[model samples]
Target: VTKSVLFVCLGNICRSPIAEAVFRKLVTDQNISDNWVIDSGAVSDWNVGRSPDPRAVSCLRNHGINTAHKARQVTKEDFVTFDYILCMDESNLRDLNRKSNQVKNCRAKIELLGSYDPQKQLIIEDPYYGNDADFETVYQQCVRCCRAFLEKVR
Candidate 1:
């Protein structure tokens, strides 16, 4: 059976998109991309219809991971559509849980994406207003967490 995952953050332009792209690249590298349906969204509507942050785009490009995703807010349907809904931090976790509760028959196992980090990092912090170094940290953290998460999912 195919598995689906949704990576989420407060705004879709930063951490969540990074997570989505990293996971996609890992699966593609493993040549098992066909068995997965991966996507990303935001807990808030602030960045809807926007592309990922330029800093994030540049950071991923440096790593040779091409991620072209428009920002969108998470919907009630996402809770029912995805097998997992992994998020960045405590706020995102709380928001997703609140939203999922209102969704009838919500099926997604919502949790912190950081939970899968082998380094024991518990949060993929917001790097929106931070500098390039911060964005770099986000990219590196996503790579670690996504790698572990992919292994478990597969």
Candidate 2:
């Protein structure tokens, strides 16, 4: 059976996209890519139809990961389609839960992306306004969290 995860952030331009890409690569490397459906979306509609923040794009590329995602808002349908809805912060989780309520049969389990982090990092900071180092820091954290998340799920 196929399982899925939807990574979410305030704007979907920074944190969530990185998480989506990293986790996708992690599964691909494990050669179980066909068993997973991965994507990223925004809690806010402000960034819909845009590309991911350049800093995030570059950070993934530096690690030889191809960045390929567009900003989209989370919808009621997504709640039922994905098995997990992992968000970057508390606000995102709140919004997702509210959205999940709109769907009569939302099957997704909403939680923080860092909830699976072995390092115990609880929230992923928005690094869109910060410099290159901040984006790299987010990239590194996503790597750790995604690895742990994959192990727990698979």
Candidate 3:
């Protein structure tokens, strides 16, 4: 059986999508990418129909990685369908916790992605208004967090 994880951020256009791609790439390179079901979403629907932030996309490409993700809002089904629901910030963690309560038996363990960071950076903030530097900072955090996530979990 496969495991699952849904990464979340406010808009799904920045932080969460990058985290998803980084995690996916990590698994793929190690030959375990298909052992799980992975995705990213917004805690809100504001950018549901859009692509990942332009800077995030370009930055991923610059690092020998690429992401193709359409922003989507998390659904009630996500509460019970995934093994984990990893979020970007405390705000997102709270939203997911509150929303998962709506499902009768929410099975996913919701958490902050940076909670797994060996670097002790416990939050991955939004980079929407900031420039490429902020996005690059985010990319680094994701690489740290996602890899640590794998080392800790799978």
Candidate 4:
């Protein structure tokens, strides 16, 4: 069976996409990309249909991981369709919980993506108004967290 995960954030443009892309690269490198269904979404519609933040795109490119994603709002269907709904911060976790509560058969395991961080970061803060260095910090955190998460899922 294919294991599916949805990375979520306040807006889909920054942290969530980074986590999605990094995890995608990890699975692809392992040649097991076909065994997984990975995606990212926003808890809000603030950035729906936009591309990932340029700094995020640049940061991933620096790591030789290319990403292309359009922002989308997390739907009720996602709560049942994905195995996990991994989010960036507590706000996202709360939002997802509230939404999931409204669904009759929510099957997704909602949790913080940072929960997988070996460094015990526990949160992936938003870099929407920050500089390139902030985006780089997010990229670095995603690298560590995604690596550990991928290992666990395998």
- Please, what is the whole-model Cα lDDT of each candidate in the order they appear? 0.90, 0.89, 0.90, 0.91
Q: After superposing candidate 1 on the true structure, give the runs of residues whose Cα lies further than 4 Å from its correct spot.
A: none
lDDT of 3 by residue, 43-120 (tens): 999988899989999889998888779999999999889998999899898888889888988899999988988889
> Residue 148 in candidate 4 has what lDDT?
90
Q: How close to the true structure is residue 39 of candidate 4, measured as C-alpha lDDT?
A: 97
User: Which candidate number maximizes lDDT?
Assistant: 4
Candidate 2 lDDT, 1-154, residue by residue in tens: 6899999999999999899999999999999999998999999999899998888888889999886798999988898889998998898888888778888877888989889888998989988778999888888889999998888885
Ranking by lDDT: 4, 1, 3, 2
**Which 10 consecutive residues of model 4 have the lowest summed lDDT?**
145-154
lDDT for each residue of candidate 1 in 27-121, tens digit (9 for 90 to 100): 89989889999999988998899999999899999988888799999999999999999999999999888888898788999989889989999
Supply the TM-score for candidate 4. 0.97
Q: Model 2 TM-score?
A: 0.96
User: Residue 87 error for model 4, in Å?
Assistant: 0.2
lDDT of 4 by residue, 1-154 (tens): 6999999999899899899999998988999999999999999998888999888899888889888899999998999999998999988888889999999888999999899999999999999999999999898899899899888885
